[PDB]
Design a protein around this ligand. Structure first.
Ligand SMILES: Nc1ncnc2c1ncn2[C@@H]1O[C@H](COP(=O)(O)OP(=O)(O)O)[C@@H](O)[C@H]1O
Ligand SMILES: Nc1ncnc2c1ncn2[C@@H]1O[C@H](COP(=O)(O)OP(=O)(O)O)[C@@H](O)[C@H]1O
Ligand code: SF4
Ligand code: SF4
Ligand SMILES: [Mg+2]
Ligand SMILES: [Mg+2]
Lengths: 276, 276
């Protein structure tokens, strides 16, 4: 068995930092993991690979001829902890649909046998500012059973979490895509943990972990590493280990209850975030 | 003559707050302005209209029958300073293309004569996390000659500015869409102004204004107002007036020079943002 998980959230919220650190913690526990980058920024694997980024399936297919000319063994790259990594890529700005590469990539990985019996987890790192095209495909086509949304007390981050939740609801009549939890990536604001716990309760899920804001992240990433690899003794490394443990142990996977903008604003006013 | 301008940038960066406050300052100077909301969040006009939000063209067309059944006089709403306001709307998450409503809305406004001779400015407030579909339409179809990008010293905000710039370059062989400037919406970080000035120089544009982070914005928005209306004496009101003056006077409209991720990272390292 393998658990197929997707990490969604608005741009810049911390999806790739959280995913790569979570996955490094899973590998440190002995889990076999693959990360599939589903964001055109295409830097979702660089901290596992010690790299600038990773060449994308779209780029590699263009050089080979067609995507079918690619060999899976040439595409997947392994880094820290044996974690396997791939990037979808996407068309250049202004050309096409920004999510088109996600569809090509996931289909290629499935056709070519990337989902090997020995994997314990797959994590898709997915752009979440719009829920359409290839960015909706992991939900629409039942590719990621467990969605975890990275968010914060920022209104826009909570709005994105609600929109992703609406996407999960839309496709709930078939497949098994569910909301597994919210991950609060802290902005160092008062009562932010309580705010995200309250949002999670309204949606029917949970806040699986509160990730502190810690500059060790910047120090590790300047060196192209997860915190897990850069400083295994860091307080923040233990935070990512706690998140990983709770993901492993999580059994709550729900069809969420999206909320109104009125409810979102009331959450913000209640926890005094806008008055901090 | 009227100047057609678009405000792009990543989600949550400050597009709608900056646009509505800039436009309120323009109205306070005597300019006639229309705001066209081109973000599915559909709250781009609420501070002009003193409102929760505004019903969208997509919603109104659905109730009327077709978009052609709508009357422009029923759709446009005027608020503070006589500023005229409309929202495009968009399909629900997981359904269709998130930008489809932008195309319908702009075409409707053009067909129905919204671009009246007496307007001095039109501002499109456009989602910028992806540059495709209806979000690319103001660039691809030559609707906004002057693009202003709201950004900050955040890596993701600068990446978005670069992607929007790539979109402008892609369509430069026809039409007249140009980059007019970067607006830095401050994160209260050291040397952020210098960083955005340097990014602008690399792109070939300018940093037209540095907007400070000021909690008066939250106090005004809780009351559904621009700072311009809520407290005309506020320091931040004068900031938006300075931005408005410089937009009025701006003559630099360029085909930008997009940069590499290497150059973006070097800008970040140089100005010590990641080490603050
Ligand atoms: N917990 C944290 N503490 C400090 N910095 C963080 C943390 N999480 C993310 N960051 C920083 O925030 C920025 C954006 O994170 P990233 O994971 O790239 O966002 P996304 O993938 O959602 O666009 C990066 O510079 C990253 O180092
Ligand atoms: N200069 C500023 N000072 C303080 N708060 C700001 C400022 N600019 C924007 N904000 C706040 O940031 C949040 C996001 O701004 P908004 O304009 O809605 O972003 P976008 O339209 O780009 O998604 C809002 O809560 C807004 O009040
Ligand atoms: S939003 Fe991108 S193409 Fe539809
Ligand atoms: S990205 Fe949204 S539909 Fe193409
Ligand atoms: Mg990322
Ligand atoms: Mg907005």
């Amino acid at each position: 068995a393998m658990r197929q998980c997707a990490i969604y959230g608005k741009g810049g919220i911390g999806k790739s930092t959280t995913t790569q650190n979570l996955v490094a913690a899973l590998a440190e526990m002995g889990k076999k993991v693959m990360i599939v980058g589903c964001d055109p920024k295409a830097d979702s694997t660089r901290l596992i690979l010690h790299s600038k980024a990773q060449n994308t399936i779209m780029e590699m297919a263009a050089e080979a001829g067609t995507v079918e000319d690619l060999e899976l063994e040439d595409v997947l790259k392994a880094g820290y902890g044996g974690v396997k990594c791939v990037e979808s890529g996407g068309p250049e700005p202004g050309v096409g649909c920004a999510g088109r590469g996600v569809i090509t990539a996931i289909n290629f990985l499935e056709e070519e046998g990337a989902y090997e019996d020995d994997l314990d987890f797959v994590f898709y790192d997915v752009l979440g500012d719009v829920v359409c095209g290839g960015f909706a495909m992991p939900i629409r086509e039942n590719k990621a059973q467990e969605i975890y949304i990275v968010c914060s007390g920022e209104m826009m981050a909570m709005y994105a979490a609600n929109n992703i939740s609406k996407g999960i609801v839309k496709y709930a009549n078939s497949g098994s895509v569910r909301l597994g939890g919210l991950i609060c990536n802290s902005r160092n604001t008062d009562r932010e943990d309580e705010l995200i716990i309250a949002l999670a309760n309204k949606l029917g899920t949970q806040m699986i972990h509160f990730v502190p804001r810690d500059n060790v992240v910047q120090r590790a990433e300047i060196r192209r590493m997860t915190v897990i690899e850069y400083d295994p003794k860091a307080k923040q490394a233990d935070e990512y280990r706690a998140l990983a443990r709770k993901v492993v142990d999580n059994k709550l996977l729900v069809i969420p209850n999206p909320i109104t903008m009125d409810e979102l604003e009331e959450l913000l006013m209640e926890f005094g975030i806008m008055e901090v």
